[PDB]
């Protein structure tokens, strides 16, 4: 049954995101495991802020206007 | 003194640019109206939740096809 941070494993990277559930969820890969689980952004933001920031930094797309 | 050297508390990021060759954020500081650029590398460390709030508000999804 245990999934997400409840597995007690360390975050490796975030590989996807969805807000279909009505809240933002990140698909998280874990160190020393081939499993990935959805975790609440609310939880990821504080438990691994730098992992969250790296997910976003890699996905920037730019536009401009005067 | 500019950016974090001004010794103010970050309030929110109001924009960004990569033109310097490195990512930088335009930072609004608490009780001030003069915002200035700070490097993303410094902001990520010194105020990660403020950075995250900025990105989260701009996250969307594109489709294929």
């Amino acid at each position: 049954k245990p999934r997400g941070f409840a597995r007690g494993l360390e975050p490796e990277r975030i590989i996807g995101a969805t807000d279909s559930s009505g809240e933002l969820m990140f698909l998280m890969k874990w160190k020393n495991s081939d499993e990935a689980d959805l975790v609440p952004a609310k939880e990821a933001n504080v438990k691994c802020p730098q992992v969250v920031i790296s997910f976003y930094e890699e996905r920037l797309t730019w536009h401009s206007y005067p | 003194p500019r950016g974090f050297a001004r010794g103010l508390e970050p309030e929110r990021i109001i924009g960004a640019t990569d033109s310097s060759g490195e990512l930088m954020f335009l930072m609004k500081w608490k009780n001030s109206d003069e915002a200035d650029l700070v490097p993303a590398k410094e902001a990520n460390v010194k105020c990660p939740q403020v950075v995250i709030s900025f990105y989260e508000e701009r996250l969307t999804w594109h489709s294929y096809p």
Binding site: G16, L60 | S19, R58, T60, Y64
Partner: peptide
């Protein structure tokens, strides 16, 4: 139409 969505972060490029 079968579709697949991917996350993007949209940023306005500022000056300076």
């Amino acid at each position: 139409t079968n579709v697949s969505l991917y996350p993007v972060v949209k940023i306005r490029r500022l000056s300076l």
